[PDB]
């Protein structure tokens, strides 16, 4: 199989191209050179060629897609009862799909996708010419020939994938931009997007300059917004970048966007993947990487002194946290000359405030053992996909034999097969990871075995850095050492760092973020945003050796941290340039400074992530404390936000200047030179979690997120739905996300399915409206969670959508049956219900694979040759899970919402989670397979055949007439024959019916929820805030038991099951919130938990809709109750388990 990837997932490399142009003598070279024109472009200039691709206008008949999208959105809105905005939504979609430029981009995306599909996973290796507009593609092995008229560019399949992904991202960007503009106060801004596209595509500067511009677009936009809307602190961030010099047109366009709306500028400027990715200059990039891993900014002696200072502050913070959490000092030994205050504080077991500014006093305090190193990592970390190298002897397997032979003139002594696994999961299966304490024993001593001292650096894909950034894949032993050290740091010491502890407790985190949002606008809390660039290639052994020693003594693991603290100096580093291999002298790499480097001062990116965080927090606390300013360090990565509170003595400007100077000075004494462009101060803009915040209100990522095993239609649609759901969870409007997702879903269906299905508007609509809940492809339509935050039953919503479709459009019920094609399972499958309470017992035909759990489990049980796995799978976990599910399926008031709860706190749930981790590893599933190429072809054929069928599944007439609540309960009764109760949640739309009170009649006043607006709302109000209002499975089980007893649920059988669950463990005895702060609640309810929150969200969504539809509210509006049958009284009688439990227990897990 050739050309496996269907999307850009690897860095763009050229060394292969250069090797094939001049070197190499394989048969494919003759064919390749034959099909190269005189004007052969370089691979580094591939984007200069794909920009010229033009397709004939309106080649794909996508009008059916337009009509289907219109109908789908109309149906969704009508179901939601927001009939005053369907006009806006479907008009926007039609305009988006009818624009000339937008349609051209969409057609280009479709052509790219079809060309990719026709060649990926092809056993053939010389696919003939393929026409793409004026280009004539041609594939050879993993190389591509692209010709337009006379110029050609010998590429790699990765380059073509990058071009295809660029076209796809531009399609997404344009569609989302039009839809978003249709729903804003300020009109369509699509023209600016098109203008930016044309301007950037018109850039003819060299490779490096063009990609510098593209990289700088976003930070320069931040600087532009910042320099205009700072009130307290100054700003010069925009000055550093050279955009206004290199590309004046882009600068003028960006300034125009800023003038229009800063939020819009941050919106559009955030796109960074919709522009062709660079080709890493591997020679220079690797040379720079290796040099940066061996440079000494600071003298080692000064670094060691500062390391001692950092050790002092680390001791201070740890002791403070330990005291605050246990009201007693940890075991410490006081050195001679210790200060009297320290003695008194230790004796009294308290923490005097004076220490906060006197960390130096802790230089005489040594912390003794407080825990033991957990040299037994849990499966959550071992079972992963991070590629690893088995040992040194496998280094020869990361290069091409032909390239090595040509470059040096000598063969490569590659053994017949790799001596060991290629990934962590394979290592675990093979039994390597069963005596970890012995595996890490060399680290304890301090002499890592020579066989485990090699590191391979890998370039990072989809990064706009021509020089490139490398992350490191490392030997199995070093990888396990890292895992153990990271777990220990994150579990035993990091929670005790008082100042740093308040950045991981979500409660404190959320409270701090809310306070920052409330105070940023008032001009009393500005933020400093440091973004280290050399952080990864930073820390030297000297700086961290003292803290490494203190940790070693703290965990009683002799020299376990110091060994990795000084390891890089004894390690061999190589660059995976598959066609630029290093020389091999005696079976080992030879240092040359470009491809190989034996011994460096740091272990590179990824390694010691947490320790570096601790050190950074330490020196930041030092820098800020000495100037006596309140601070709230907030950050985890190389970019950190420092929140500084106003001081009554001096204005924010002087405070910011002093803080920045101190940070410069102290980062200077760490070998972490901090430059101007990496730090900026602002009182209007700040960033956290890769998510901007302008004047407190978040900047939606509509244009960015919506622009984001073997492949299959189901997998692609699921990824689309998940991305759109994440965007909706962000500050993106639910309507923007929903419309964009509908458009994208229709495009995706158009790419795959044959014309017969596509040109069937009614069928296409029905397909888009049949969600997975009733059995069908994932769709953005059927998603109640888009508009809500809590758990919600999707079934009533799906039935409501189908009912509305039937009532409104010309689709007949027989067609719905044809598409839905209901197929009740022959026998109950209790495990599926337990692991997903709100699902019907139906055959999920479109699912990529069903019952595969036993296949993976069975494959793991055999062909293992391990010990941990053997004890982990003594008897089939799937069979026991089914047993437990059946056991829990004997509650006379069968309430799956609790069956899932009970099943959750059992060892079998953890075992199924581990199996899920195993299958998630694409290596395990491929190992289980016993190719995938035919599997996809068969899969595509089956679905294409399935819906082309004209067979019926089950007469749905009785299930699409009444309340979706009652209908859903009837459906569950039918599909399990047990009158399932306790999980159906009504649909807010049918439960109520919004009414404006302008025309309200006395009949409507009897019962409803009223919404009182303080003043008339407007589009401006939608973006400005107002004023109106392990063993832990034992504690959760205990609180569940306390919950039951408090409610007086005391059942002998349930008690026995719960006690068994205990003894097997060992124990024995925000989108709309801004408007929400603009209205007032109403508790004047008669009947009606969490569901009420959904009603409130719907009520305020009505106002959002009427405002966004060019309307205004003059009087309070009510929410009458329309469907009475959608109301019920719940008693929750008891969990009468009936038949006695038979699960027993595992006792092997944990």
């Amino acid at each position: 199989i050739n050309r496996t990837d269907q999307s850009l997932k690897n860095p763009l490399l050229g060394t292969e191209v250069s090797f094939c142009l001049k070197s190499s003598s394989l048969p494919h070279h003759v064919r390749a050179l034959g099909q190269i024109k005189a004007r052969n472009l370089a691979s580094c200039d591939y984007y200069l060629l794909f920009r010229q691709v033009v397709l004939p206008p309106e080649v794909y008949p996508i009008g059916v897609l337009i009509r289907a999208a219109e109908a789908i959105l109309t149906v969704i809105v009508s179901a939601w009862k927001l009939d005053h905005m369907t006009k806006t939504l479907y008009s926007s979609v039609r305009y988006a799909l009818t624009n000339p430029r937008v349609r051209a981009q969409l057609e280009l995306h479709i052509a790219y996708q079809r060309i990719v599909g026709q060649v990926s996973y092809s056993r053939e290796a010389d696919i003939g010419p393929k026409r793409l507009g004026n280009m004539s593609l041609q594939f050879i092995q993993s190389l591509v020939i692209a010709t337009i008229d006379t110029t050609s560019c010998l590429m790699t399949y990765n380059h073509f994938l990058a071009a295809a992904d660029t076209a796809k991202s531009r399609c997404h960007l344009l569609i989302a931009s039009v839809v978003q503009g249709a729903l804003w106060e300020q009109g369509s801004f699509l023209d600016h997007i098109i203008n930016m596209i044309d301007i950037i595509d018109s850039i003819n500067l060299p490779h490096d300059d063009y990609f510098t511009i593209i990289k700088s677009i976003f930070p320069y936009s931040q600087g532009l917004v910042m320099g205009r809307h700072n009130v307290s602190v100054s700003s010069d961030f925009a000055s550093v970048f050279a955009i206004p010099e290199l590309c004046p047109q882009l600068d003028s366009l960006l300034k125009k966007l800023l003038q229009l709306d800063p939020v819009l500028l941050l919106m559009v400027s955030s796109v960074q993947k919709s522009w062709y990715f660079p080709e890493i200059r591997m020679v220079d990039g690797s040379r720079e990487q290796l040099h940066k891993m061996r440079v000494e900014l600071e003298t080692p002696q000064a670094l060691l002194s500062y390391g001692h200072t950092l050790l002092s502050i680390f001791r201070a913070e740890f002791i403070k946290g330990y005291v605050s959490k246990n009201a007693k000092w940890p075991p410490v030994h006081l050195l001679p000359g210790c200060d009297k205050s320290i003695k008194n504080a230790r004796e009294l077991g308290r923490w005097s405030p004076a220490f906060d500014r006197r960390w130096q006093l802790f230089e005489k305090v040594v912390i003794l053992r407080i825990a033991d190193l957990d040299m037994d990592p849990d499966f959550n970390d071992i079972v992963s996909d991070k590629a690893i190298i088995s040992s040194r002897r496998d280094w020869v397997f990361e290069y091409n034999a032909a390239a090595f032979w040509k470059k040096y003139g000598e063969r490569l002594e590659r053994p017949p097969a790799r001596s060991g696994p290629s990934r962590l999961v394979n290592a675990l299966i093979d039994g390597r990871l069963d005596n970890i304490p012995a595996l890490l024993e060399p680290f304890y001593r301090g002499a890592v075995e020579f066989e485990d001292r090699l590191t391979v650096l890998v370039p990072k894909e989809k990064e706009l850095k021509v020089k490139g950034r490398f992350f490191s894949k490392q030997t199995l032993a070093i990888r396990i050492y890292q895992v153990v050290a990271e777990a220990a740091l994150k579990n035993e010491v990091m929670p005790y760092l008082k100042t740093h502890s308040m950045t991981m407790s979500s409660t404190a985190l959320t409270h701090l973020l809310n306070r920052l949002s409330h105070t940023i606008t008032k001009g009393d809390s500005f933020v400093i945003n440091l973004d280290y660039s050399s952080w990864c290639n930073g820390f030297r052994p000297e700086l961290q050796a003292p803290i490494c020693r203190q940790l070693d003594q703290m965990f009683n693991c002799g020299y376990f941290f110091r060994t990795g603290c000084t390891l890089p100096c004894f390690t061999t580093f190589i660059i995976q340039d598959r066609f630029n291999p290093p020389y091999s002298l005696s079976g080992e790499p030879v240092e040359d400074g470009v491809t190989c480097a034996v011994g460096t001062k740091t272990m590179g990116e990824g390694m010691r992530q947490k320790l570096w965080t601790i050190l950074t927090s330490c020196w930041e606390i030092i820098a800020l404390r000495e100037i006596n300013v309140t601070f709230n360090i907030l950050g985890q990565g190389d970019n950190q936000t420092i929140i500084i509170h106003k001081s009554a003595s001096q204005n924010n400007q002087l405070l910011a200047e002093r803080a920045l100077g101190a940070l410069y000075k102290h980062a200077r004494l760490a070998g972490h030179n901090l430059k101007v462009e990496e730090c900026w101060v602002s009182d209007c803009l700040y960033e956290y979690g890769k998510k901007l915040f302008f004047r407190g209100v978040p900047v939606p990522g509509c244009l960015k997120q919506l622009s984001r095993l073997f492949p299959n239609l189901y997998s692609k649609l699921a990824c689309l739905t998940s991305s759109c759901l994440s965007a909706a969870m962000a500050d993106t409007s639910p309507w923007v996300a929903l419309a964009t997702g509908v458009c994208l879903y229709l495009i995706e269906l158009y790419v795959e399915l044959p014309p017969a299905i596509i040109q069937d508007e009614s069928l296409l609509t029905t397909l888009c409206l049949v969600g997975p809940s009733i059995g069908g492809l994932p769709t953005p339509a059927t998603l109640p969670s888009v508009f809500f935050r809590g758990m919600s039953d999707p079934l009533p919503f799906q039935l409501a959508l189908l009912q509305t479709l039937i009532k409104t459009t010309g689709v007949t019920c027989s067609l719905v049956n044809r598409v839905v094609k209901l197929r009740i399972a022959p026998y109950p499958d209790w495990l599926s219900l337990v692991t997903d309470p709100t699902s019907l017992n139906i055959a999920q035909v479109y699912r990529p694979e069903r019952q595969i759990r036993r296949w993976i489990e069975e494959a793991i049980a055999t062909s293992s040759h391990s010990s941990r796995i053997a004890t982990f799978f003594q008897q089939p976990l799937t069979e026991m899970a089914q047993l437990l599910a059946r056991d829990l399926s004997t509650m006379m008031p069968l309430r799956p919402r609790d069956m899932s709860a009970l099943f959750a706190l059992s060892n079998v749930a953890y075992g199924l989670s581990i199996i899920d981790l195993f299958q998630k590893s694409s290596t395990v599933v491929s190992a289980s397979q016993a190719d995938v190429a035919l599997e996809s072809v068969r899969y595509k054929e089956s679905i294409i055949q399935g819906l082309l069928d004209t067979t019926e599944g089950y007469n749905m007439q009785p299930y699409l007439e009444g309340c979706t609540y009652l209908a859903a309960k009837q459906l569950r009764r039918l599909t399990w024959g047990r009158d399932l109760v306790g999980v159906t949640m009504p649909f807010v739309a049918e439960q109520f019916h919004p009414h404006s009170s302008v025309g309200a009649k006395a009949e409507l006043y009897l019962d409803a929820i009223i919404y009182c607006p303080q003043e008339t709302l407007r589009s401006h109000h939608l973006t400005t805030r107002g004023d109106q209002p392990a063993a832990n499975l034992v504690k959760d089980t205990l609180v569940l038991h306390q919950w039951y007893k408090v409610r007086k649920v005391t059942d002998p059988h349930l008690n026995t099951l719960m006690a068994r669950f205990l003894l097997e463990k060992g124990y024995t005895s925000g989108y709309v919130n801004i408007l929400s702060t603009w209205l007032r609640f109403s508790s004047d309810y008669l009947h009606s938990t969490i569901h009420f929150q959904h009603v409130f969200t719907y009520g305020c969504l009505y106002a959002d809709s009427v405002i966004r539809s060019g309307g205004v509210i003059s009087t309070p509006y009510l929410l009458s109750a329309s469907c009475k049958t959608c109301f019920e009284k719940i008693d929750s009688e008891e969990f009468v388990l009936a038949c006695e439990p038979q699960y027993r227990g595992a006792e092997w897990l944990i």
Binding site: V366, P541, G599
Partner: protein, 50 residues
């Protein structure tokens, strides 16, 4: 007073421990610094787990 005269020995031990650890830090870094670019072996710096 049979134990107080012993605790001061322990503190004397712990004081030496820091002395040894500082020696190790310095010596370890000297050797590591000269080991860059050479095939110098990675000598152990701690006897063994008990």
């Amino acid at each position: 007073i049979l134990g107080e005269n012993i605790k001061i020995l322990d503190r004397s031990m712990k004081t030496m421990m820091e002395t040894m650890k500082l020696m190790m830090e310095k010596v370890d870094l000297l050797y590591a610094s000269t080991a860059v670019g050479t095939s110098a072996p990675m000598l152990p710096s701690h006897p063994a787990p008990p």
